[PDB]
Ligand binder design. Structure first.
Ligand SMILES: *C/C=C(C)/C=C/C=C(C)/C=C/C1=C(C)CCCC1(C)C
Length: 133
């Protein structure tokens, strides 16, 4: 399914530290981020996504339309300008963030009752799994 709608509660979060370090997120921020439970709320209407990440610390939204390139300034993350593009490869939603970091972006897909999110930057891969609330 391409339907990724839902309130998704983080079940596991593998190598978030390595991914954040590849992005040059500061030590103290990584230390806090790595311990927090994330909730990811996805509102998906056709090609339009409104994505909201929440934790007890930082909360972060990003909206995009599938197949429409968009500039991002990754404020409150690594503070870089990237050109972002989110497209479908089969039932995998693929984001590429073109810019300074190589292999930067993510892949997101549904398997059964779970949402999988693989974040990449440089040689690092972070694997997150969420379950619907
Ligand atoms: C569809 C899935 C999306 C848009 C995933 C977005 C992921 C984030 C906004 C992640 C944010 C963070 C980090 C990369 C590290 C610092 C802590 C967070 C949660 C602000």
């Amino acid at each position: 399914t391409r339907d990724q709608n839902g309130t998704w509660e983080m079940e596991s979060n593998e190598n978030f530290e390595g991914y954040m370090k590849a992005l040059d997120i500061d030590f103290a921020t990584r230390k806090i981020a790595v311990r927090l439970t994330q909730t990811l709320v996805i509102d998906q209407d056709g090609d339009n996504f409104k994505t909201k990440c929440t934790s007890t610390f930082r909360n972060y939204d990003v909206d995009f339309t599938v197949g429409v390139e968009f500039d991002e300034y990754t404020k409150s993350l690594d503070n870089r300008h990237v050109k972002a593009l989110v497209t479908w490869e089969g039932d995998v939603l693929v984001c590429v963030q073109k810019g300074e970091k190589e292999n930067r972006g993510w892949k997101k897909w549904i398997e059964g009752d779970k949402l999988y999110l693989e974040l990449t930057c440089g040689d690092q891969v972070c694997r997150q799994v969420f379950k619907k609330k």
